[PDB]
Amino acid sequence: STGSATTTPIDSLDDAYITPVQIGTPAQTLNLDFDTGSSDLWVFSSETTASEVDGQTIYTPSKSTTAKLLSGATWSISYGDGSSSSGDVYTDTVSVGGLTVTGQAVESAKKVSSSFTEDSTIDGLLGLAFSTLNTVSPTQQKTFFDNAKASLDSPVFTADLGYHAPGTYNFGFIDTTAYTGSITYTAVSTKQGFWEWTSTGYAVGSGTFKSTSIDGIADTGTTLLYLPATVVSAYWAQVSGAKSSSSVGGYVFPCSATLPSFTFGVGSARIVIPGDYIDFGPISTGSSSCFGGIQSSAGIGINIFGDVALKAAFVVFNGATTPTLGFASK
Numbered sequence: 659s660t661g662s663a664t665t666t667p668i669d670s671l672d673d674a675y676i677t678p679v680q681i682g683t684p685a686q687t688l689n690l691d692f693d694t695g696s697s698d699l700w701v702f703s704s705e706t707t708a709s710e711v712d713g714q715t716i717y718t719p720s721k722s723t724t725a726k727l728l729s730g731a732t733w734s735i736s737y738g739d740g741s742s743s744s745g746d747v748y749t750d751t752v753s754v755g756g757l758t759v760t761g762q763a764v765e766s767a768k769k770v771s772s773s774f775t776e777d778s779t780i781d782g783l784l785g786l787a788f789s790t791l792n793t794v795s796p797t798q799q800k801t802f803f804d805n806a807k808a809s810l811d812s813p814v815f816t817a818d819l820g821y822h823a824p825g826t827y828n829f830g831f832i833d834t835t836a837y838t839g840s841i842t843y844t845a846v847s848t849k850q851g852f853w854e855w856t857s858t859g860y861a862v863g864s865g866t867f868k869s870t871s872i873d874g875i876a877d878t879g880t881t882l883l884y885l886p887a888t889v890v891s892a893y894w895a896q897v898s899g900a901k902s903s904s905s906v907g908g909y910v911f912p913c914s915a916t917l918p919s920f921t922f923g924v925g926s927a928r929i930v931i932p933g934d935y936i937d938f939g940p941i942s943t944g945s946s947s948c949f950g951g952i953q954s955s956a957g958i959g960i961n962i963f964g965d966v967a968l969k970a971a972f973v974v975f976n977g978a979t980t981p982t983l984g985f986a987s988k
Contacts (some may be wrong), residue, residue, distance in 0.1 A: 660830035661757025663690065665819065671938055672965060673881050677827055680753040683720030688715050688781035692827055693879030694817070694975065696851055697791035697801050697963070698735050699752070700743055701782035701900035702774075702936060709829030710770050719766065725750045733765045733793045737956065738880070741773040747794055754784075755874055757829050759806050763792075763799035772870060778801060783879065786815065786975065803829070803977060813977045818988070819969035821935055837972035837986035842927035846981040850960075852877070852959040853975060855983050857912035858925060860885075862893050862920030867928070868897075874961030876968060876975070876983055881937070883931070883966040884955035885894055885921070892899045893920055893952050900950070907942050909950035913940060920952060922967060923984040931970040 676689035681701065688701055689856040704712040719725035725748045734744035745768035767782070774780065785792070789800045807813045810830030818836050819825045823842040826836070847854045853936040861867040872885065890909065894900040896918050900911035911917070917933030936951035951966040974984030 659757055659806070660811055661753070661755035661806075662826060662827070663755030664824050665827050666824045667820065667822065668777070668965075670822070672819075672822060672969065673975070674780065674944040675825070676753075676781075676876070677754070677784070679784060681717050682719070682750045683724040684722075686715075686717055686722065688717060689779065690782050690784040691879060692784045692786055692788045692817075692965070693781050693877070695875060695877035695879045696735065696737065696783065697787045697789055697800055697851065698733060698793055699782070699784045699894075700733065700735070700745070700762065700767055702770070703745070705745060705855050706767045707769055710775045712775050715765065715781045717734055717764065717765075717782075719748045719750065722750055724760075725764075727798075728794075729761065729798075730798060731763075731794050735793045738962075739773070741771045743767045743770040743774060745769065747799070751961045753836065754802065755827070757806055762802055762805055765794065786878070787853065788848050790848070790853045796979070797827075807832070807977055814974050815977070817975065818966060819965055820880070821969050825969070832974060833903040836936045837988040839972055839987055841972070841984040841986040842924045842985040843974070843976070843982045844914060844924050846976075846983055848981060852960075853981070853983055858923030860923065861921040861928075862888055862896050863933075865896075867921065867923070869923075871923075872961055874955075874963050874972065876963050878965065879969060880962045880964030881966070882962075882964050883936075883952045883953060884958055884962040884964065886961065887954045887956045890952055891952045893918075902954075906949070908953040910941060910947045911950055912945045913948040917945070922963075927985065929971045929985055929987060930966070931967060935966055935970060942975060
């Protein structure tokens, strides 16, 4: 089997991407944030505290003939940006782009933090990291990908995120028309539950490539690119007037600037992030100070290849017995 679904930015800055997911019988379609940095499939639901729902589409298990309470199971998750959610668990039929999993754990939110409530466009998350991170207790549950894996033509999914445009998540096949040149594969460590890999270095604009190992995670659920302070300083030093602002919470730059590209290494291959991808616009409406798309990972504890990086590539998440990650230009 295979699946193929279009993923669409939630706003003009590509802050996140939503992908339609069919849950239950008859189908209830929710727009979920596919997150390769977590492993819970959770939704706004009929159980969500009413004051914490503001425009989201909810899953109502009582209207699904295939929903079954997973008795005794609860979940609770906190994300790197400080947001959180928790609740109980149903099993139900879940389909993505024509690919169907029966008995998928659908985690129903009883509570969500303010950032989720305030984002009317995201109806929940669909985790695509390793199932060892799943938060369901007392019986840990598998991700949608893990459940689908054995039925897939090939044990892979791919992320092809657009810049200010829709893209695609595919399951079970590699679309050889969706990228240019070849795919370069690189080793993955699952020790922390993430799609964790080591970039071979970076360049800033037309500058020389610096060979240096940068361990980090491929995370579709993080907006920006978070790298070591040394790397990030070298980037922003090439933008006149750029500075790190503790009041704003990272590097800002004059909105009048033309940003240089940023290149990262994947083995001997190179992925180029155009300068425009690094512009996250005014810090507040009407401001001439703009927020940078490359930020320091210092104090996160991990480097994160988020959407800024991933949308510059066609990315293969290979879930074979020995997982790997592949990157191609496009």
